[PDB]
Design a protein around this ligand. Structure first.
Ligand code: FAD
Ligand code: MCN
Ligand code: FES
Ligand code: FES
Ligand code: FES
Ligand code: FES
Lengths: 45, 286, 161, 796, 152, 158
C-alpha cells in the first residue's frame, strides 16, 4: 500500500479528528485505577 | 529442586519410629538432619512416599561413656560432636573429622547417625568409624542387633541395615590415653566430599607402634578399613620404610571413582598421601 | 462472620463476611472487582450499580450477606471471553459516553438491565431508565446515544436517531 | 556542605545497601502479581536427537496445570526460534531435534513451581539419537554430523559454495602477508595452543522473569533479569509484533549478572507467550543446574598463538588463529560486526609492527554463549593469549619475562597508539605501573628466592615449587563508537537524563543497568561534582524502559565509558543553562561568571554569586524570558573511542607437587582505569573479579563427555570459592585518564578477571617451567597439577 | 507547563506532560497534537500524566490551561523532534535541509518526491545511524511559558 | 496439608503446608519474606540461611513442616524495632560487604550466629565460619571486614 497524502493523514487520527478515546478501553471494563482501588501491604485506613 | 510429594511423620519414640517404618515399608525413609536425603529428594533420585522424622526422639541424641566405650546417639549433630569437650578428651579424632565435614549450616543439622547410615562413600564418618572399630546399634521390629562399622557397608547406598531398622547409636571403643590420631582430607573446597581422606589412630611405646588402625574415605564404593596397612605399621618406628609399606597396602585396596575430583589413579595415590600425612600427625600426637 | 456462597460474573464465590459489610465493599475490597465505585453516601448516584438476580442494584445499599446465593454481574463480567466488548461497552466508547469513567461501570451495568427491560427504548425512556445514575462529566447526552447505539447493535436495526 | 557533597573520588557508601541489608531489594522472584502462574521447562535428556513425539497429555491433565507449550504452539507466531545477538537464531522449544542436553522442549505452566515440576515429569519425549559432536576440533571433518538442519545443508568440506555445515563464521583481521613474512624470517618463533576452557558466569541469582500481558490494554509488562532492558524491549517488539510503547520492560534489582543476563533466553519468550495466551502473569525462574547448563557459557577458545621475535627479545609479530566453540546456536553476545568480539586486542600492551588474527566459530552439541563472565567481548581470551605467549616466548628466549615485557611495552608518548589489529589505545603509562608493581612485590628478590627453592627441590629438600605469575594487560571497554559498534543495529551509545526539582533535588536516569556495580551510588557522584549538589539529593534509576532514556545496557565495563560520560555531559548542559540563569539574575554577561563549586560568581566581584540551588529555584520561579523554565537535560553519548584501562598483576603461587595443591602466597593487582569515581567501589569490583579469575584459572569448568552429557554443571562440582579458598587481595593503582572521556574515567569492572586469569595461570606455568612442563592447560586444580608432576616423573 | 516526547527505535512514542487529566481526554488528545506534528499515528503514541517521578514538572490541570500550556509545549517539543528529524533526513538523503519538504509523515526532496524518509525511518536512523554531528535518539522536552492567556 | 505454628521474627505464624514445601519457599512464597534467597539447588550457597532455634540453617534443605514450633529469624528481623540497623547490617554497609545484595541476607544471618558462637573471631575463624555462604560479587575480603566491624560495635555496646 502506497497511501495517498490524505490517506496517510487520516490514519494519523491527529489534529481535528474525532479520535475515539484510548481511556475508554479500561474505563468501560472497570480497569481504571483510581485511588480507592489502590491496595498496599499493611495499608490502614 | 522440587521433591515429589510425601507424607510426614513425627514418631515420639524409637519404638514408634520402628513400628512406622516397618508398617509403611520400603517407601518410608527415616529423616534425620535431612542434609543428604532432602538433597536427593530435590533431584528426585529419592522419591519416598513417607518421611519419618526422628526429631522428637530424645533418646537418639547424646554422648556418654559406658564401660570402655563412648556411645553416641544417632541424632547427635556434627555441631554437637564438635562442641563436646568430653568427646574431645576421649576421641579427639571426631572433632577433627567433623570440622572437615560440610559447612556450619550443614553441621548444625547433619547427624552422626545419618552420616553413618547414609551409604554414600563420600561421607567422612564411615571410614572414621571403621578406623575406630565402632559398632552400630540397630533396632528394628525383631529387636536390637549390632553390626560392626567394618561390616556395615557394601556399596553406594547399600548397607547392612534391614527393613524397619533404625541406627540408634554408635558405640566407639575409647583408645588409650595419649593415643595418636588424625583425619587428613583432600578436597576441592569447603563442603566437598573427599578426593581421598584417611583416618588414623595409633599408639606408641618405646618408639614403636603398638597399635594402628586406618580408614580410607571416598576411594572405593564404600569406606574402607585398611587392615593390612595398619598391621604393617605395628612393631615399626613409623619410619619411611614402614609408611611405604602401609601406603602400598592401602592403595592396593582402593578402587576410586573417576569424577570431577580426578581420575581413579590420582585418587588412589591421594589415599596414600593422606594416609602418610595422617600417620605422621598421629605419630607426633602419640 | 457469615459464610456466603454466590456467583459473580459466572464464577462461584465462597466467602466469609461481617454482616455489616456493604456489598460494594465486599465486591471491591474482598473480591478485588474495583470497577464498581462509590460516589455517594445517600444512595443517589448509582456508581455502585451491579446486576444482581436480574435486577439493577445499588450495591452500597445492600449488605453482602443479603447477596448469599445470588448471581451478580459487575462491569468486569460484561466483555466477551474473546476480548470483544459488549454492545454497551462499545457504544459508550463510540458515542463518547464517558470522560472520567467513574460512573461508567454503574451506567453500563444499569443499561445492561435497561435494555433487557426494554430492548428498544425511546430517548425519554432511556433518560428515565437511567435516572438512578448520576454523571458529572457528560451531561448525559452522549450516554443516551451510547445506549441507543447498543440497542441498535443488539437489535440489528436502529430505532431513533 | 563540604561533608555532604560526596562527589567524585569519595568513598561514598552505597545507597543500595540500605534495602539490600534488610531484605528489601526487589529481585524478580520477589515479584508476586495477581493470578500469576509459574512456568518451567521439560528439558532434553539427549545432546543430539530427533524428537519423534512429545506426549503432553498427562501433564495437561494434571490438576493445576494451565498450559503445556511445545514448538507446535510457537511456530504459528514465528516464535519457535528467537534471534540472537550474534545474528543466528536459537530454538525456543525444540522442534524437529534437540541439539544440546537440557535444551528446552516444552514449557509447562502451572499454579506454582511445585505443580509445574510435577507436570514436567509427566511429559514423555521419544528421541531418536543422532551422532553427537562435542569436539570442536572435529566439527568440520567430512563426517561431522549435520547439527543445524534448520539453517544449513550438508556441506562436508571447506571449499563449497557454503561453509562446512558446522562452520559458523570465519573472521580475520590484520596484515596476513606482512605477518607471514615476518614469521618466515624471524630468528625465534614461539608457538603454543592455549585453550581457554569453558566456564560460566554463574551469578548467584539465576535467570528469570515475570511476564504479564494485560489483554485488556494490549500491553505487556516484563520483569526480568536483563542487563540491557531497552534492548530486550526492542527485540520483544520486533518478534512479538507488539509496539514498544506497549511493552514495559522492568529490570529491577538483579542478583548479579556477570554477563549471564545480557541476552534473551527461551524462558523469557515462553513466559511471554504463555502470558499472552493465558492473559495472566507467568513467572519463570530457573534452577542452578539449568542455569549452568543452558545459559551463556564463557570462553571455549582454542588459541594457536605465535610470537615472532629476535633473539634479544624484540617482538616482531603475532599470529593467532582461534577455534571458537559456540555450542549449538551462535548466541554469542557481541556488537554485530564483531563475531569474535574484540579478540583483536590480542597484541596487548606491546608495540609490535604487524599481526594477524583469524577466528573460526563452530557449532557443537552444547549450550550457547561465549561472551560472558567479564570477558569484555573476548578480551579475556585476547589477554590470556598474549600474556601466556609472552611467558612461553620468554622461556624460549631464556629471558626473564618481566624484562621481555619492559622491552616491548608501548611507551606513554606513543598514545594514542594504533595497534596492529586496528584499535587505537587512548592512554597508558605501562612502564611506570610495571615498575611500581615490581617494586612493591620485590620482584627481583622473588626470582632469587625462586631459584634457591628450585635448587632445593632438586636436592630433595622440598616438595613445594614457587611460581611468579605476571599479567600486564590492556583492556578495551566502553563499546562503543557508532561507526562500528551496534547491538542488532542499535548503535552502542548510552544515555542520561537529569532533572532538577524546584527545591534543588534531582532525579536522574541512565540507559545502563546495574547488577551490583553501584551505579545508584556512583552516577550521583558524577552529578554532585558537576553541579555542586549533594549526592544524597540525587536519585538514580535504571532499568524501567518506560522511564529511563534508551541505552544499551551494562556489559563490557561500558557503563562508566558511556552512561558515565552521558551523565557528565548532561550535567554540563544543566550547568550551562544555570550559567545563563545566573547571568540574567546578576545582570552580567555569562562570560563575566565563573563556577566555584556550587555557585556562579561574578569575576572580580566574588561577593555577587548565585548558588546552583538558587538557580534551580529561579528556573521555576523567575525563568529568564529568553529561556524555557525548568532545569534539566538529556545526553545520548556516542563515544569517540573505547577506553583502554590497564593493569599490572603479580601472583606468587606455591604448589605441592605431590598432591597438586596450589596455594596463592600473594596476589597484587594494580589497576589504572583513569579517573576513579569511587575508590571503595572499584576495590570491591577488583576483589570480586580477582576471585572469579582464581576460580576460572584454578578450578572452574563446564565439560561435556563423548555422549554430550554436560558434566560438572552444579555446585557439587563447579568451583566457586568460599571465603576459605579465596585469597586475600592486595590492590593498587595509578591514574592515567582517558583523554576523550568527559571526566577521564575508564571502565574497570572486568579488568580484574581479564588480567587475573593469566596472572594465575602464568604463576602455575611458571612454577613448573624449571621442570619443562610446557604449557599447562587450565584449570589448575589439584588432579591436573598432580598429572603434570606425574608426567614429569616427580612422584618416583 | 511541559511536555517530554521520546520516540523509540521502532517508531512508537512515550510522551508525558505536566498536566493531569480528570477525564478531559488528554491521553487521547495530546497524542493527536503529536501525531500531526510528527506524522506518527496517534495509536503509536502513549501519553502519561500524574507521576511526579516521571512526568516533566508542570502546574497541573485547572483553569482550562492544559491546551494553552501543555498543548503548546507538546507542539513545541514535537517541533524540536521534527527539526532533528529533518537534519537526519538531510543527512541520509544527501541534500540540504532547505531542499526538503514535509508531506504528512515524511520528508521528500523538493522536485524529487521519490527521494524521501518517513518519520518512522528517521526514528530508526537516529538510533541505528546517527549523523556524526547529532546525538543518537529522537526526543525532546519543552517547558512552555505562555506569552498571554487564550481568550475563547 | 499439615498445620504448623512457629515464630518468625518474633511474630506468631500459623499455616497449612504440604510436607514437601521447602522452608525457603514457605518463607518467601507464603510468608512473603523475600529477603532470603535461593542461589542453588544442591545446598551449597547459603543464600537461604535463616537463624532457626539458635542455628544457622539452609532453609532450602529443610521442609517447612520440620520448622513446626521453631523460632526463625530472617533478615527482615535483624533491624531494631525503631528501624536502627543491626551492627552487622551497618558493618556490611560501612565496609562495602555487598554489591548485588543477593547473598547478603544469608551472609548476615549466618554472621549473626557466628558472632554468637564466637564474639571475637579471628579472620581465619570468620572465613571458616562463613564457609557455607557463597558470594559472587565481593571476593569475601570486605565481608570479613564487615564482620570484624560488627564485632567491634557489638563488643562496645555493654
Ligand atoms: C553441600 C553439602 C556438603 C556436604 N559435605 C559433606 C562432607 O564433607 N562429608 C560428609 O561426611 N558429609 C557431607 N555432607 C552430608 C551431611 O554430612 C549429611 O548431614 C549426612 O550425609 C547425612 O546425615 P543427616 O543427619 O543429614 O541424614 P539424612 O539426610 O536425614 O539421612 C540420610 C540417610 O540416612 C538415613 N538415616 C538417617 N538417620 C538414620 C538412622 N538413625 N537410622 C537409619 N537410617 C537413617 C535416611 O533415611 C537417609 O537414607 C554434605 C552435605 C551437603 C548438603
Ligand atoms: N573509573 C571508574 C570506573 C568505575 N568506577 C565504578 O565502578 C563501577 C563499575 O563501573 P564500570 O567499570 O563502568 O563497569 P559497569 O558498571 O559497566 O559494570 C559491568 C561489569 O561489572 C562487573 N562487576 C560486577 N559486579 C557485580 N556486583 N555484579 C555484576 O554482575 C558484575 N558484572 C561484572 C561484569 S561481567 C561487567 S561487564 C561503577 O559504580 C563505577 O562508577 C569508578 O568508580 N571509577
Ligand atoms: S455509591 Fe452512590 S448510590 Fe451507591
Ligand atoms: S464519566 Fe465522569 S462521572 Fe460520568
Ligand atoms: S539456596 Fe543454595 S544453599 Fe539454599
Ligand atoms: S553481594 Fe552479590 S552474591 Fe554477594
Amino acid at each position: 500500500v502506497e497511501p495517498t497524502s490524505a490517506e496517510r493523514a487520516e490514519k494519523l487520527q491527529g489534529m481535528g479528528c474525532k479520535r475515539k478515546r484510548v481511556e475508554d478501553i479500561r474505563f468501560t471494563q472497570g480497569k481504571g485505577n483510581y485511588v480507592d482501588d489502590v491496595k498496599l501491604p499493611g495499608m490502614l485506613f | 529442586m522440587i521433591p515429589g510429594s510425601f507424607d510426614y511423620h513425627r514418631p515420639k519414640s524409637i519404638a514408634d519410629a520402628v513400628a512406622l517404618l516397618t508398617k509403611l515399608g520400603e517407601d518410608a525413609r527415616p529423616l534425620a538432619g535431612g542434609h543428604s536425603l532432602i538433597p536427593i529428594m530435590k533431584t528426585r533420585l529419592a522419591t519416598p512416599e513417607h518421611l519419618v522424622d526422628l526429631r522428637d526422639i530424645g533418646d537418639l541424641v547424646g554422648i556418654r561413656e559406658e564401660g570402655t566405650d563412648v556411645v553416641i546417639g544417632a541424632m547427635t549433630t556434627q555441631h554437637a560432636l564438635i562442641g563436646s569437650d568430653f568427646l574431645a578428651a576421649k576421641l579427639p579424632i571426631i572433632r577433627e573429622t567433623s570440622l572437615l565435614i560440610a559447612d556450619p549450616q550443614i553441621r548444625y543439622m547433619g547427624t552422626i547417625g545419618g552420616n553413618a547410615a547414609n551409604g554414600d562413600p563420600g561421607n567422612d564418618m564411615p571410614a572414621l568409624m571403621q578406623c575406630l572399630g565402632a559398632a552400630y546399634e540397630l533396632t528394628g521390629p525383631e529387636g536390637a542387633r549390632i553390626v560392626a562399622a567394618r561390616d556395615y557397608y557394601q556399596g553406594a547406598y547399600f548397607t547392612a541395615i534391614e527393613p524397619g531398622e533404625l541406627l540408634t547409636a554408635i558405640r566407639i571403643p575409647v583408645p588409650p590415653t595419649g593415643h595418636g590420631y588424625a583425619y587428613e582430607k583432600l578436597k576441592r573446597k569447603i563442603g566437598d566430599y573427599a578426593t581421598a581422606a584417611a583416618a588414623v589412630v595409633l599408639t606408641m611405646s618405646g618408639g614403636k607402634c603398638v597399635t594402628a588402625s586406618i580408614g580410607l574415605t571416598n576411594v572405593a564404593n564404600t569406606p574402607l578399613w585398611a587392615e593390612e596397612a595398619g598391621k604393617v605399621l605395628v612393631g615399626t618406628a613409623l619410619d619411611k620404610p614402614a609408611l611405604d609399606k602401609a601406603v602400598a597396602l592401602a592403595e592396593a585396596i582402593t578402587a576410586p571413582a573417576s569424577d570431577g575430583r580426578g581420575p581413579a589413579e590420582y585418587r588412589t595415590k591421594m589415599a596414600g598421601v593422606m594416609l602418610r600425612r595422617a600417620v605422621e600427625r598421629a605419630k607426633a600426637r602419640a | 462472620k457469615a459464610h456466603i456462597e454466590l456467583t459473580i460474573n459466572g464464577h462461584p464465590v465462597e466467602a466469609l463476611v461481617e454482616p455489616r459489610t456493604l456489598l460494594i465493599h465486599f465486591i471491591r475490597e474482598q473480591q478485588n472487582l474495583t470497577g464498581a465505585h462509590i460516589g455517594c453516601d445517600t444512595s443517589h448516584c448509582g456508581a455502585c450499580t451491579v446486576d444482581l438476580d436480574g435486577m439493577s442494584v445499588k450495591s452500597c445499599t445492600m449488605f453482602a450477606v443479603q447477596a448469599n446465593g445470588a448471581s451478580i454481574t459487575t462491569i468486569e463480567g460484561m466483555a466477551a471471553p474473546d476480548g470483544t466488548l459488549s454492545a454497551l461497552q462499545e457504544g459508550f466508547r463510540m458515542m463518547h459516553g464517558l470522560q472520567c469513567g467513574y460512573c461508567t461501570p454503574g451506567m453500563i451495568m444499569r443499561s445492561h438491565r435497561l435494555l433487557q427491560e426494554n430492548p428498544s427504548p425511546t430517548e425519554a425512556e432511556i433518560r428515565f431508565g437511567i435516572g438512578g445514575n448520576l454523571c458529572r462529566c457528560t451531561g448525559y447526552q452522549n450516554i443516551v446515544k451510547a445506549i441507543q447505539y447498543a440497542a441498535a447493535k443488539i437489535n440489528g436495526v436502529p430505532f431513533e436517531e | 556542605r563540604a561533608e555532604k557533597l560526596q562527589g567524585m573520588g569519595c568513598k561514598r557508601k552505597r545507597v543500595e545497601d540500605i534495602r539490600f541489608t534488610q531484605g528489601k531489594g526487589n529481585y524478580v522472584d520477589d515479584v508476586k502479581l495477581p493470578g500469576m502462574l509459574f512456568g518451567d521447562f521439560v528439558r532434553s535428556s539427549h545432546a543430539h536427537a530427533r524428537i519423534k513425539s512429545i506426549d503432553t497429555s498427562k501433564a495437561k491433565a494434571l490438576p493445576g496445570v494451565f498450559a503445556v507449550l511445545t514448538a507446535a504452539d510457537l511456530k504459528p507466531l514465528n516464535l519457535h526460534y528467537m534471534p540472537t545477538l550474534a545474528g543466528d537464531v536459537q530454538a525456543v522449544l525444540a522442534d524437529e531435534k534437540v541439539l544440546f542436553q537440557n535444551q528446552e522442549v516444552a514449557f509447562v505452566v502451572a499454579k506454582d513451581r511445585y505443580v509445574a515440576a510435577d507436570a514436567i515429569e509427566l511429559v514423555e519425549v521419544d528421541y531418536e539419537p543422532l551422532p553427537v559432536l562435542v569436539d570442536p576440533f572435529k566439527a568440520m571433518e567430512p563426517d561431522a554430523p549435520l547439527l543445524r538442519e534448520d539453517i544449513k545443508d550438508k556441506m562436508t568440506g571447506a571449499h563449497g559454495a557454503r561453509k562446512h555445515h558446522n562452520h559458523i563464521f570465519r573472521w580475520e583481521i590484520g596484515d596476513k602477508e606482512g605477518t607471514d613474512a615476518t614469521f618466515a624470517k624471524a630468528e625465534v618463533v614461539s608457538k603454543d595452543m592455549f585453550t581457554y576452557h569453558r566456564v560460566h558466569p554463574s551469578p548467584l541469582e539465576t535467570c528469570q522473569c515475570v511476564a504479564s500481558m494485560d489483554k485488556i490494554k494490549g500491553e505487556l509488562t516484563l520483569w526480568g533479569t536483563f542487563q540491557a532492558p531497552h534492548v530486550i524491549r526492542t527485540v520483544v517488539s520486533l518478534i512479538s509484533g507488539l509496539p514498544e510503547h506497549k511493552i514495559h520492560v522492568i529490570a529491577p534489582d538483579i542478583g548479579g549478572g556477570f554477563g549471564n543476563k545480557v541476552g534473551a533466553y527461551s524462558g523469557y519468550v515462553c513466559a511471554v507467550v504463555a502470558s499472552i495466551v493465558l492473559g495472566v502473569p507467568v513467572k519463570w525462574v530457573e534452577d542452578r543446574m539449568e542455569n549452568l547448563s543452558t545459559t551463556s557459557f564463557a570462553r571455549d577458545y582454542h588459541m594457536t598463538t605465535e610470537l615472532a621475535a629476535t633473539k634479544d627479545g624484540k617482538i616482531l609479530a603475532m599470529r593467532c588463529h582461534v577455534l571458537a566453540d559456540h555450542g549449538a546456536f551462535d548466541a554469542c553476545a557481541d556488537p554485530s560486526k564483531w563475531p569474535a568480539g574484540f579478540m583483536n586486542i590480542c597484541t596487548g600492551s606491546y608495540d609490535m609492527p604487524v599481526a594477524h588474527l583469524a577466528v573460526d566459530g563452530v557449532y557443537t552439541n552444547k549450550a550457547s554463549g561465549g561472551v560472558a563472565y567479564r570477558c569484555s567481548f573476548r578480551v579475556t581470551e585476547a589477554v590470556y593469549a598474549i600474556e601466556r605467549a609472552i611467558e612461553t616466548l620468554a622461556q624460549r628466549l631464556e629471558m626473564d619475562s618481566a624484562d621481555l615485557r619492559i622491552k616491548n611495552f608501548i611507551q606513554p608518548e606513543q598514545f594514542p597508539y594504533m595497534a596492529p589489529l586496528g584499535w587505537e589505545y587512548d592512554s597508558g603509562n605501562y612502564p611506570l605501573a610495571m615498575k611500581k608493581a615490581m617494586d612493591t612485590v620485590g620482584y627481583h628478590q622473588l626470582r632469587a628466592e625462586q631459584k634457591a627453592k628450585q635448587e632445593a627441590f632438586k636436592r630433595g629438600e622440598t616438595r613445594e615449587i614457587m611460581g611468579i605469575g605476571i599479567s600486564f594487560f590492556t583492556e578495551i571497554v566502553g563499546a562503543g563508537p557508532s561507526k562500528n559498534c551496534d547491538i542488532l543495529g542499535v548503535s552502542m551509545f548510552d544515555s542520561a537524563e537529569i532533572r532538577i526539582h524546584p527545591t534543588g533535588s534531582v532525579i536522574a536516569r541512565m540507559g545502563t543497568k546495574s547488577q551490583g556495580q553501584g551505579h545508584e551510588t556512583t552516577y550521583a557522584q558524577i552529578i554532585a561534582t558537576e553541579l555542586g549538589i549533594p549526592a544524597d539529593d540525587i536519585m538514580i534509576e535504571e532499568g524501567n524502559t518506560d522511564t529511563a532514556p534508551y541505552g544499551l545496557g551494562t556489559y563490557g565495563s561500558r557503563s562508566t565509558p558511556t552512561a558515565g560520560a552521558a551523565t557528565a555531559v548532561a550535567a554540563r548542559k544543566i550547568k550551562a543553562k544555570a550559567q545563563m540563569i545566573a547571568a540574567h539574575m546578576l545582570e552580567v554577561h555569562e562570560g563575566d561568571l565563573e563556577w566555584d563549586v556550587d555557585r556562579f560568581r561574578v569575576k572580580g566581584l566574588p561577593e555577587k554569586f548565585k548558588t546552583m540551588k538558587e538557580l534551580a529555584w529561579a528556573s521555576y520561579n523567575s525563568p529568564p524570558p529568553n529561556l524555557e523554565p525548568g532545569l534539566e537535560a538529556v545526553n545520548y553519548y556516542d563515544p569517540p573511542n573505547m577506553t583502554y584501562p590497564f593493569g599490572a598483576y603479580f601472583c606468587i603461587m606455591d604448589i605441592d607437587v605431590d598432591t597438586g595443591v596450589a596455594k596463592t602466597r600473594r596476589f597484587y593487582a594494580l589497576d589504572d582505569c583513569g579517573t576513579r569515581i569511587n575508590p571503595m567501589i572499584i576495590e570491591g569490583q577488583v576483589h570480586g573479579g580477582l576471585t572469579e579469575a582464581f576460580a576460572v584459572a584454578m578450578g572452574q569448568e563446564i565439560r561435556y563427555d563423548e555422549q554430550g552429557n554436560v558434566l560438572g554443571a552444579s555446585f557439587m562440582d563447579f568451583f566457586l570459592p568460599t571465603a576459605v579458598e579465596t585469597p586475600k587481595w592486595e590492590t593498587d593503582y595509578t591514574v592515567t585518564p582517558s583523554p576523550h572521556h568527559p571526566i577521564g574515567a575508564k571502565g574497570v569492572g572486568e579488568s580484574p578477571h581479564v588480567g587475573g586469569v593469566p596472572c594465575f595461570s602464568n604463576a602455575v606455568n611458571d612454577a613448573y617451567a624449571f621442570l619443562n612442563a610446557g604449557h599447562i592447560q587450565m584449570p589448575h586444580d589439584a588432579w591436573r597439577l598432580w598429572k603434570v608432576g606425574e608426567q614429569l616423573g616427580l612422584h618416583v
